[PDB]
Design a protein around this nucleic acid. Sequence first.
DNA 1: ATCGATGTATATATCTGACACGTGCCTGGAGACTAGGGAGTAATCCCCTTGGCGGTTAAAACGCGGGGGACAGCGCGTACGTGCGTTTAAGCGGTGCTAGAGCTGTCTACGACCAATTGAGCGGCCTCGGCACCGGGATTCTG
DNA 2: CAGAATCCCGGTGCCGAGGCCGCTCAATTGGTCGTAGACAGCTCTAGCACCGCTTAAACGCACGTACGCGCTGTCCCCCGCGTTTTAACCGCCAAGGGGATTACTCCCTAGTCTCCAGGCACGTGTCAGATATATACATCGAT
Lengths: 93, 93, 78, 80, 108, 108, 96, 96
Amino acid sequence: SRKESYSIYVYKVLKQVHPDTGISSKAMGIMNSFVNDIFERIAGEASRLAHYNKRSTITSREIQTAVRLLLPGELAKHAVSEGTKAVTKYTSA
Amino acid sequence: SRKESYSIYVYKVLKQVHPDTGISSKAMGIMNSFVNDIFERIAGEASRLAHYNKRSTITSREIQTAVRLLLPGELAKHAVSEGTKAVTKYTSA
Amino acid sequence: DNIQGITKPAIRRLARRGGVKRISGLIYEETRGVLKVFLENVIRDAVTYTEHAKRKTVTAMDVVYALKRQGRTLYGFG
Amino acid sequence: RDNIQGITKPAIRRLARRGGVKRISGLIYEETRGVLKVFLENVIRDAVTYTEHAKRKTVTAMDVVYALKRQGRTLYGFGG
Amino acid sequence: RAKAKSRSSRAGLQFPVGRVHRLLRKGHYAERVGAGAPVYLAAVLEYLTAEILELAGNAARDNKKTRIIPRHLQLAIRNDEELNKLLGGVTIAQGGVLPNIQAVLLPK
Amino acid sequence: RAKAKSRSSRAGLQFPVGRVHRLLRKGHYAERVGAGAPVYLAAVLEYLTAEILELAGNAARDNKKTRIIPRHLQLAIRNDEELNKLLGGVTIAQGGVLPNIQAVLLPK
Amino acid sequence: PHRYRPGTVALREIRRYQKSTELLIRKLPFQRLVREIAQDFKTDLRFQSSAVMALQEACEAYLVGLFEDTNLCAIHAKRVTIMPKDIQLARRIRGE
Amino acid sequence: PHRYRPGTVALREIRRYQKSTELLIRKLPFQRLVREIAQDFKTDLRFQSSAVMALQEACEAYLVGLFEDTNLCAIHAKRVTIMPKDIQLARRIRGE
DNA sequence: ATCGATGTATATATCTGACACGTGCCTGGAGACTAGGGAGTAATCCCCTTGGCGGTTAAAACGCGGGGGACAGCGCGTACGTGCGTTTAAGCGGTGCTAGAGCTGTCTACGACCAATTGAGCGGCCTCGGCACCGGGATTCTG
DNA sequence: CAGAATCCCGGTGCCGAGGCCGCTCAATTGGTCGTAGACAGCTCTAGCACCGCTTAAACGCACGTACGCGCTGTCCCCCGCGTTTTAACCGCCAAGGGGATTACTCCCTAGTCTCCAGGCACGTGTCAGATATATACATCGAT
């Protein structure tokens, strides 16, 4: 019955980037499928990295390496920078 | 450490198909890679088929459907008969 | 024989979107065969997923999964 | 360095002969060298990435097999 | 029993760390999942979302519109050399093609 | 206590049903594995193995050799219109290429 | 009288159809074709209204890209008219 | 003295190299090239004896396939001599 | 140099249904505690990677003669594009039927987890004959 | 039709593949028990069928011009053969950096229970975008 989607969080981001613009439901559907795709790619590669080393757990090292393998050179540097910033803020809270 | 391989089973099959012929070490390494390749492909599709239907168990129907999706027409046509015969004899025993 | 429903004007419109300026008279019958071959490979997979679920109605998700398996990810239909 | 010049003209001709090319224009050699260098760079970046994740210092054949596998080409005979 | 507060508020993120943590455990990727994995993955997904929305919103103004539609997403992706490499195989419905005519075809 | 009999001998297969069942459990493909899965998968892997080895042996015999070598595996796969489709993206070390020359290139 | 020279209307159509985003194949004739092909696999099948739309979007997106590739291999031969051998070469190099 | 006409030896070389199986690039020059490129990513790296052989097999297979595609592009223009634009067209259609 | 007949776009007014917001409530995220085995650290063995020398022929570099291929220019004849009048059937708006997708309830057959037992198959060793190299003869094919 | 290239046959000889032994840890047999999923019944969504009407789009024809194709000429850049030289390949000797393993123990994650607020359906209403009309001004082809 009850569905589950990211439309709330996408709208929250949109109002931070452009507080004067709105988004149609058809565009929201594409934005919703985009996150599910990249999520599945990263989690897949992280699982393979863990299996090759014979480890039972997934950690931030697997996520960071998967990001460096999957994302292009300029996107990777920024994504890694803010991922480490977020983790540092969480652990220091 | 001890390393497992399919070399003895491939050799038993070779002795059944061509008793007089032999096989070199490099050919054995190729066959040992081909078997792991197809194993991972079939297990992957069987896993996807289970999650799309909210099932918690892998069964012979998931293997049969994965075989029909991965292999070409005549190969799938024969492989399905081989698997059905094997499972039927195992259950009747 | 409904392949004749893909008319010559529609093929020309598709060629125009692709930037083709001048079109030879034999392109139409070649294009019909190419499309006919493409559709069958997708429908066979969609029907396979429909049958595994024991349903009688082909569903949009069956087509989405059939296309993704071929490397043609489609965004917009869930 | 000059090491790219080690892929001599005769080697390129032998490769073209295996592919069935009968006559070769004199400008193909520098184009082939440019095409080969980007392929090597792409495979080696991934191989070193796997080597660094394991904290190893030696690059092994498995790192190469996994890199090629990720690029979409599978090599049989070296492991895996 | 102190008053509960979300992990996303502690990390400073908009995306849901709890839902991501649940989705990792329910996928059978591994038997154990560490504490830092969901915060890192949520931050990455938020970054890529904001970049896409920024380019689409700029493309909307160039057409004097006030609402984003699939055409603006297609133009935003196909005009950026980094996003176009990541999404090379993806097809977007109602996106259309970019305008392009070969110089050989134009009038003499 | 009854004398043990292997599952492969019950099914009549050469491949190890026990090893396949172990690999299915350790790979985390799902939380439960039915008893019929490994017998079916073992029978399929055995079929494809024998299907390849027969053509390789025939190629070795035509070359008047007694040991199969990678050249014979390449010649076997690339001459079959169905094996070549399943293994199109695979390169075999020391396999070489099939003899082929364009008719336009041969002398009059 | 008044008459445009050959090729000006073709360029105006190119500029027209590259700006719009609507579907170009007739919906009902395509639907009957989908119904006819599926019958070879199973009888009495039913189709959701969105399944036909997903199929139509995928087919048109495929054909546009194929014509884009065919035009480059037509220009390479110093021609402007596209011909069957251009499609055949594009498909052979694409591996399909 | 006896002299073969232009092209007679080329066909003989084609037959010779299509029937053989050994590698065609010199091992030491390729090994130095591999060690040179890697130095840009990490310093003081070490390489196993089999990693270089794996890389050489992959590179030679890639180049042979690219030449096979380029020869079809040359014949399409009614030429015999392969030229750089044939490589650029093949790579463009392959999407490299 | 330009006219003038066609075409694309812009500016104003009217309409309508898609979007943004508020309300009720329920099920899934957060707080607190316990148990236990996965990962981190330190120490040892030894193997396989890097570095060097000597030397001999296989392979690369440099010249040159000439011929056959790539390219530009010309003629011609018919395939395709532009525009009109006719006719086919797509699109739309409305009503009605019922097949089958989605859900709740009961319960019983299946697979996971432990413990004791032993034999299947992996590592180290032996050896002998399949293959490869040398040299000379037979056949083919080309200029 | 002389003669240069490929194939094949008889002899030598070596190290890679086929077979044996020891033995240990992974697979089998027997038992319990918890819950995943097979079956029966019900609701009511939305897929299928039929009708009448307007008019958008497809079809068939004429005609004339721009393109595709075949032929001729010429000139220059690839191919084939010979000589010189340079650095690849093989074999033998040193040594030490780093991979792979074992033993200890601690701190990280899984699990259970409570409880409470985040976010999911549902309802409302008002303004962004779609449309019809008028007209501005840009472009293409002939004079």
